[PDB]
Design a protein around this nucleic acid. Sequence first.
RNA 1: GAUGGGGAAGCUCCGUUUCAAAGGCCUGAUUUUAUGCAGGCCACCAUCGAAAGGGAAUCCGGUUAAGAUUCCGGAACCUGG
RNA 2: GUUCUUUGUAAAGUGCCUUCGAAGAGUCGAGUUGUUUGGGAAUGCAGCUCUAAGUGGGUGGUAAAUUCCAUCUAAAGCUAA
RNA 3: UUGACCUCAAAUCAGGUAGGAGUACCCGCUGAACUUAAGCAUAUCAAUAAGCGGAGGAAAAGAAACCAACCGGGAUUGCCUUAGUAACGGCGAGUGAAGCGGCAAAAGCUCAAAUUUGAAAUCUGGUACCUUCGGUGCCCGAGUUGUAAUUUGGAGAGGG
Lengths: 121, 119, 203, 50, 49, 116
Amino acid sequence: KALKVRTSATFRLPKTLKLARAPKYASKAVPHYNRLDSYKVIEQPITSETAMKKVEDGNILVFQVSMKANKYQIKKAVKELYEVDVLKVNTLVRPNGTKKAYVRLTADYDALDIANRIGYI
Amino acid sequence: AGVKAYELRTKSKEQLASQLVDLKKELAELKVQKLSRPSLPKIKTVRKSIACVLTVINEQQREAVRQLYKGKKYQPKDLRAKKTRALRRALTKFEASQVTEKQRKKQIAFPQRKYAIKA
Amino acid sequence: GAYKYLEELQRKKQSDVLRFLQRVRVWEYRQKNVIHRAARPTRPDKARRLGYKAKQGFVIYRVRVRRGNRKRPVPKGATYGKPTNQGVNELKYQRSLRATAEERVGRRAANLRVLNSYWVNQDSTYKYFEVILVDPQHKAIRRDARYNWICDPVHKHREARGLTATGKKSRGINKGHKFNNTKAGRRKTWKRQNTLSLWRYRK
Amino acid sequence: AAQKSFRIKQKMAKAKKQNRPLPQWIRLRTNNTIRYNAKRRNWRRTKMNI
Amino acid sequence: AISKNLPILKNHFRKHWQERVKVHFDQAGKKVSRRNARATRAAKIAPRP
Amino acid sequence: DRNTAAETFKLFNKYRPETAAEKKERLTKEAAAVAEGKSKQDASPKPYAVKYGLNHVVALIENKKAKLVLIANDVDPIELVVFLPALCKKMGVPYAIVKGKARLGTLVNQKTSAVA
RNA sequence: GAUGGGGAAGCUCCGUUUCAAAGGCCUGAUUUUAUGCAGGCCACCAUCGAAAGGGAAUCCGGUUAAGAUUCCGGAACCUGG
RNA sequence: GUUCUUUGUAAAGUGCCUUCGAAGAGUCGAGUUGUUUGGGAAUGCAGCUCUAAGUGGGUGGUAAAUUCCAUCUAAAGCUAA
RNA sequence: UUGACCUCAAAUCAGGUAGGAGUACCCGCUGAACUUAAGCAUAUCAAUAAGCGGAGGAAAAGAAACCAACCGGGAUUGCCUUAGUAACGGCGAGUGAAGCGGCAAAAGCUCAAAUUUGAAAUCUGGUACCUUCGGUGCCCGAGUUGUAAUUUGGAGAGGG
């Protein structure tokens, strides 16, 4: 025969137990593979005369790029594939709906050597 | 023609991944050549080869999951039968054939008989 | 055998005991929400004879419905027609309040099927009904052949189509000379005796 | 405009790629009736309403 | 609208009847279906009559 | 009163019912006795358990076979139980309104019983 | 303009802090503590809504056929860690 | 047409004597309102008010009382062509 | 103090289900006016169109609280007829069924209300196993505020 003592005149939800997920079956069978890997991130170089000029002069590669991709991914893909360190990436969306990346490499690497290694010029 | 799934199904996950990576490399070089030069339709074959390899990989993974959830309740929804919604809904053959005991006794006592009107 | 005593006792409604209970319970249900679940039936005899069984997948909801007529909406009381159709107020809604109740609880719990319903209380503002519902995806009811008919897809929203008892009463479906306009589908019998049937070989 | 949504720009790109005349080789095909591209959409004549 | 010596006719066509005209072109086909149903039923059922 | 109720529940807890464990035990015993003795309804002794259930108990009261009836001061659908004093008086049965359908359930191996 | 609730045969309406048990900030506990537990803190209670209102922080020179306070060079600043 | 299990001191059906024979209420029904119907002193439906019985109740197309008769058995429910 | 019950909650709890489309045909709600009446209000158009809710391959209805007044038939549905009939109707315009009969097709049943009381005999779920569109065992639970067997009116039950 005793009673609780309540200093506030407010009743709130008792913080009862939040029990965690423990499913009997997976939500999907197989994990999806990486949806945006490096070969999906970089599609094609861009070999317009302006882009090749920027290769020769600014040490800048010009790539066609997935619209779902961002600068982090582009940098990661370039470093992964062409074995190249990377400064500033700039990006635009072209008037045709594809993304264009201006990747500036560091001073140690030569974007033209990288380009003729990739095959184009 | 490229690759053949009956040749790929004898391989493992790792060989298939290496094959796929090599194919993606090749596709990239072919994309470069496609713009350096006027036309290159080998890119079609290598694209479909990538497709066949991914198909085989998905198949292997799914049959592994099936053998993991083999013969137990609560399989995944991408692995149950799809049949159609309304069929996945109302009754099964068992539940439909369920019959009360009064009706069972009456059925056994007085089933429909074969009869003929000549004599 | 208690259900018989309960039947007759609930029959004696204007007795002191049951009008005391009327008052207490109408207060209680007025305090609770318009639609709320009843843990148990308040008239187990009535639920029982209407098809309730105390097993898993039978559910009881309680529901208020606002009482009286149907005022025609008609902004500012205007109908824009002939004086036969100028009435706004004294109009009386061919379905019952029991039906409206069934509709509302079925719409709240669409995963269930309405079986039936029964009066429990009333006041001047509200009537109070208890609706019996059945879970058709519960495997007791998918089995239990006496109730597996409810799991056939031709029994979705029986209340909406008028297949409950009050729905058939309102539809006017009983036998006899008194129900000739509505014995098998008012609109269907209208349609057939306004069909011109013409054969290949005629007059 | 010039401070656009991506949704508007996406549609403008499809309209840039749609605004070309026929490939010539399509006139040469077997059972061909397409003589010209009907759905041309010059910016003077007809606005696309986004 | 009333004219020479003729009977008063009561033709009930002041409704949209053209929407509910039924012509039984299906007469002979329904007959065929009915015979086939009888035959199927006999066979499927039994020697029962 | 609490003392009388204590005595009452002692008396009833002597005549508790069966549970599943000892029911399976006596089922084994009877399956054995039907094999060896072949004595049907003669192996296990007569049970002297307490009778529960409302329809059961009402029928017992009507046929005057009940010797003592306990009734809960509980149930909320009170119509279930209001008529029982009148019955026990009409039929000459001693009835007692005790506190706790939960007590009755505890002795009778349920949660609630409402009578005993 | 949701929710809670209430209306409405219903499409939906009201209303946005309400007749709601409408949550989180930290602390210890510590090297069983995962994050529970001994505690104490708070009361308000969605979301949308302004390329002219509020608002963290950049300038110069040069450069293209056509881009630039966005690129090159140089010189700075803010935020977060 | 074949083959394996006989589940079964289980279940069902049939005759005579006797004692019983539970049968659905805010419902039926009535008054009023409105709507509807070929339905006419009110065919059905609905709202409000009143509200039953048990050898009873409904129906028997002119309202009412009295006496009879005939025929069904509501207010719970499933079901092919 | 410890452990129950009742009621009520919360959980990204385990497992499920509802939504929307289509909508010719079907079940309902809601609901006009044009028009006809040589005007027009009742009426008629029409218990229609439009609006809303809800289903299936058909739906609904359905095994009498029926029809009848017969020497009595006997669930429902549909066709031929009854019938432009009885009846309604500013008895004006107009509206307007049903029983019988002939045929197609045919099919019948289930619950509640009963103490099993010498034995909740019933059921979901979880787990282990298996000849796995389900079965057996074991364990929590639901449930006697009544789950199974038995009986539904044509009958039927308890005894002998």
